[PDB]
Amino acid sequence: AQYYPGTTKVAQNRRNFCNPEYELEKLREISDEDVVKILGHRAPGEEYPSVHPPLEEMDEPEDAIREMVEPIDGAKAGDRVRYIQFTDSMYFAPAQPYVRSRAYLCRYRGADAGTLSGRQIIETRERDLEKISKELLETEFFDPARSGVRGKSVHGHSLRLDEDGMMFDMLRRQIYNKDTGRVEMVKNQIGDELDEPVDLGEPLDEETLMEKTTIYRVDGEAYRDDVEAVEIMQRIHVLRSQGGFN
Amino acid sequence: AKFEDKVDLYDDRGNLVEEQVPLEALSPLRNPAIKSIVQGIKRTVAVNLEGIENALKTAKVGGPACKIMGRELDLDIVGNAESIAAAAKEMIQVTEDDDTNVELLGGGKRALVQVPSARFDVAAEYSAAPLVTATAFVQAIINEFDVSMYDANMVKAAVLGRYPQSVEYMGANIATMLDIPQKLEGPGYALRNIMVNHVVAATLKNTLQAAALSTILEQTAMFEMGDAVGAFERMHLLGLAYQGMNADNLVFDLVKANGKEGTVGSVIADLVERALEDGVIKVEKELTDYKVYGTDDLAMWNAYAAAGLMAATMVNQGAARAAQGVSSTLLYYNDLIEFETGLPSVDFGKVEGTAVGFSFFSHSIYGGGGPGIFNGNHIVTRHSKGFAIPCVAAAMALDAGTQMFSPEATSGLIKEVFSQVDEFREPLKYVVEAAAEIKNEI
Amino acid sequence: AKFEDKVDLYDDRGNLVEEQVPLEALSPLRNPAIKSIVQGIKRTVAVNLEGIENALKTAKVGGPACKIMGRELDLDIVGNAESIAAAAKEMIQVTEDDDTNVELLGGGKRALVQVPSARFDVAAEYSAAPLVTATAFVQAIINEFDVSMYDANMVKAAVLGRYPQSVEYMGANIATMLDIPQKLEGPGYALRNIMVNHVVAATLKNTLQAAALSTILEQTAMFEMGDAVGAFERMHLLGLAYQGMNADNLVFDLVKANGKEGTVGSVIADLVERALEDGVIKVEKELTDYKVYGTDDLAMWNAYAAAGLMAATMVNQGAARAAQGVSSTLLYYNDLIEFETGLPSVDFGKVEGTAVGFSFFSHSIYGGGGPGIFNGNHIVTRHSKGFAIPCVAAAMALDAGTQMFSPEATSGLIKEVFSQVDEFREPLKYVVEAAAEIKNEI
């Protein structure tokens, strides 16, 4: 598949995030327990709650589509559907809202993705959400200064950065330590205090954010100069226009 | 035939039924099984005899939480159901042995009623079904027990509710799959105001049959609204056949190839490969490491893309066995396929636009609700001209129990009565059989 | 037969046509001419090609006083009417040999369109007639002149108006006798929302034909509403026969006896004497110098009193050649006959009550208007179940020019087109002939 037109670094990064045969660069290690803490849906040690019984205990009648589509493991078990949500700064965060939803529906099964200017969300069965969330948090989808895990009070994507290069957060979930140059998550994504903070690594430096970003800007790569990407968007405009007429 | 196209027809197990049938043998205007389904849904009513009896004994009539103390009437309606049903049938029919059906269900607790077809060929619309059914049961109950002139108005309230003070039959103990003509968002929309959960209940959650019934009702409405007239008619018919009727086994085969491990993106890649293999699209220009595709048949490209969009919903929401993400599939299947190809998405962007508002109105505070409560007449999901709602019906058929407003919650009276009717329950069987029967008359 | 009654049927000149016709042969459920009229009403549209051309040339589209400067388009639509109508007809029809009719009138300034009955048998209601007609004419005008994508939306505004920003086709240059389904006062009302001036225009002001068309539409709606089901059916059928079909020549003979010098009161005296002579009423009790009449057949008393009410309208408003007093005749014919007899008036007081409100709302500041702008769906005149509005149609047929909102003011487009159709213009003929044809099948 080709995913997206264009000849800039931005365009190639957008293709890479969509392409399941591109290996997402892993930038940091997070334990399974600390991913459950950041999510905030269950306590370490708590069994997965269920919304319905396991599919095996259901005995549904014959349906060729059900028989051909393998359920994800959380669906087999009857897990609740839960979420993880991110905000990405317009000052060169690596991922951005539509790049996420497009990539999630190429790489992940059983996925409900939503895009907005200040937040982007995925909802799926709980145990599968924990495995996807580890990849979202450990890889180049995430920078701990320019991206934020936030289930509410999302304001910041369009704000000036603070003195430390950190995006605004009304609830201060991610704290940069000026003495150490590392960021710690000190609350879960809905803003409750964690018993012990989770290290998220060092912010990426400016050269690496420019290598990895998927936003076009006049002080980076401008969209108007990626003339092949612009030509495809204008083509889809004109073809939709003519098709609705005759 | 006005068009040259032919399609191969399959069953709900993916086995060939009839080869090379003219496309117009599936048209709502020609297929006799689609006529029988539209006339059946115009004329069929569910009667809750147990609900009438309980409303009367408790004086709980006229809408939620309402009661009139002192007006209670204790009548053995369920115990005398046979005699009441027979008396109501004699009023509902036009002649003895015509197409009127009155059948008890649930040991007399419910009745399936099919008002005779001849009453509709002399009516402007479809309200004779609840109105003639309600009055025949109200008069049969008053006659069974000799209810007095002073008390009979309580029977009327328990059957049809607060109408005509309310515009709707608010609190009624009868139900239809159609809703009142005043609630149409525009003229021609009545076959669109049919709740997704009602289609999933009548088809017993068989995914292909729920998608077929929804596509039949949606694209039939597109005829009545004039959208399938003239330049646009072939686009609508091709959408019916490929997205709703599994023409050429394309939705089935894309689901088979992507069910084990697939995603919305893997279904897009398989559909683009199959459109190129079949000559529906071709490379028009090369840009830098990017092929621009064109087509000389936009209606057929739209129909292949629509079939892919239905298979992507079955793969994504079937994998989660959770309907909610159908709003995301309907958005990003279309968004991704435009940047994958340089061609316009399904319904020229109108599926994507329906899916942006449907996503918002199924995950926000402002309105909407879960996927099952939408319909082609809802303000959020009326905008695509038949290509979106049938995928919601497929996703709700696949849902294993994630919804509070499930078909068990909203549609149990519809389920018990309408799933008895073979053409509503298994319309993919009956409409393909009828198309093969008329194939040399088109 | 369910009923034993028979009636004798006459033409609009008072001559016998067919004797001893079973009552059910005139039922809207059985009579095939009533079926053809109702299906005709559903599928017929008037197209004003001159109006479309003038709206385009001036950019005056979207409702009263509206104009878009700089959007003017000068198209020779009436000069190319034949080609435009033929191209529309090929999109409107289903097949080559169906019952689609497209006919130019007025040198190409107007077209009569009858959409094929088959599009209705797979539709929920009747809006396919204006919506299929409008799109086929918009597409045929665009194709005739090769109107560009940038300008074509002005053709759509000139044909169908401000819809869908407005709920109605506000500013449209097409017209139908029915109105949109959202305007029904209740479910089942659509055959009642037909302006009295449109029935009088269609029937060319022939008084008996205007009364017969109005009664067939009102009483056919009574079946669709369920009012004519079970205990009430015979009442409704005898009303149709005696008030609308001149059964037994009762209406005609009352008018002949009272036309020269009679009043509403002289008609009442004759009708009471005729009821007594036929055995419909009899003296039950003597008070002091006052006979109290009774009846063993309330439906037949009601029908005879209904025939007298129609005759009283024709005598009173015919003598003035001024329709306004129909509101008074509907009130006091019923008020006088109850104190004349001790029996209930037409529709058990519901005509009298409709007449009270109609009188007020045709002589006051609050609403309503002249007789011609009422209809069975109007809030003021919906209350009688078919026994009032036909008299208003007979009164407006008899008006010699007293009304500002006359049929020439409100209904000229409807007159030109719909009076071409023989069964709309002269329904009494066709429904009589049909009743004779099926008389042995009842």
Added chain:
Amino acid sequence: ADKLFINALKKKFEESPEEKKTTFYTLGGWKQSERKTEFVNAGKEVAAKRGIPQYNPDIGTPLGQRVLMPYQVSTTDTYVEGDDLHFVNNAAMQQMWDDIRRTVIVGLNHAHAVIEKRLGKEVTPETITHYLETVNHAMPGAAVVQEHMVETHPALVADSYVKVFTGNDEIADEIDPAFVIDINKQFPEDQAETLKAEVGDGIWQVVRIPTIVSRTCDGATTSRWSAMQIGMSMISAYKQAAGEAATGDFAYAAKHAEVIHMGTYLPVRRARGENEPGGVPFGYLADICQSSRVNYEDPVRVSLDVVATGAMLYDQIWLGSYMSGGVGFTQYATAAYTDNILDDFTYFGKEYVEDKYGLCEAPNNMDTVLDVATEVTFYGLEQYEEYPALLEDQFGGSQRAAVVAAAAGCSTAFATGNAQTGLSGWYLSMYLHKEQHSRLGFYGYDLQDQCGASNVFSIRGDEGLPLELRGPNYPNYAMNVGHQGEYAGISQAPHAARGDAFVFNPLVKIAFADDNLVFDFTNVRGEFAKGALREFEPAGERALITPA
């Protein structure tokens, strides 16, 4: 020169507007703001008086971790916190809506024909003037025929009256001038000649019912109230029986056959009668705004005053209350009428088109849409990338999408002279913006945006309509903020560049050219600022009939 938004940005923040970093969390939360401090204090007083907790800054999350900004009302030097632009707190905004809701236009042409034909009586300038004195007593709720009538208090209903207009100068001259909207006085000479030719010898009433009645009841009251009192004044002034058959023709004409409602009724899911915001087409909203007859040598000022009228009515009052409610949608609307931001972008586009093509001179086609809407979309997006303080001001993507696409769409229509190609430029701007920044608006913002290109030129039943006839009930537009008022501006734009006196209905344009309105429709943004300052005096209050 400085971009037009620089002064406002320099007022909001201590940094120059180009600066990329700031500091947060040290402003004391809500305590930084005069208006939030007023609200905290008032909440405690409210909750004690009524015995139920109410406004409390410690419920939920703590506002004011960043600067709570002032806003400049565009074209003014007035700066206010955004709460002063919420419609609940702004009596000028409430009055703007009451003056539209309580107005109807009612012909006298049928009525004069019933008088001459059915009654056989004469109509002259004299009998019209006598009728207008009578209806100006009756219309606010006072009696002219019956004994023992009880009446409305004149000072509670002092904003209700009836005027007339006509294209016939020599009647407009012969009727008492207190009652006449004088076209020649109110409009420049070229627009006056267009408008008089449209009206011709027709004579039309502009009827305003009392604001206190509109507020008690609803928009569908207005044409009924108007017709009752026209009916009483026709009976009194022309000597009818007080209630005869002809009286019904005056009622049908005033209620149905010669009325112009400001809005048409709505479908049942959003059930509302006439004269509600969702029924007002975009062409009428541009003709209600009176900037066209004052600012006609500046088509950008005329178009942006229409955007301000429509963003406030359709997003704040209509979508943000009638169709939702709560805190609502103040700043989704304020983005289109504050800080001179839309003004900077639209003046750039106008200059681009005047230099390249000349106003109204470009081909009306897709080549022009692709050229102008792409150039103006990139200009507006570049400003948010060059000025960090501008991006932090219009912080929500939906606000930026509506402002950039309004400038692109208006500029396209200034080139073509046709609103439909301006609408196609609005949708192309959305698609380019979404790809440039990898975001657009809120979760549901581009439902109409993605249907948009395909429905601009469609001709199908519920799809096809010129933009001037569309409104908040066009199906794709029925739900979402950040579009409707901007579409009213695009509807105005080609007509302001052409010099046209009106956009869609010349009777509506004349009906608001009246200094007896409470709100001043020639200066909508000035009025919003007066209301924000608590300096506007609305009608409708009950002070005269309540204790001191």
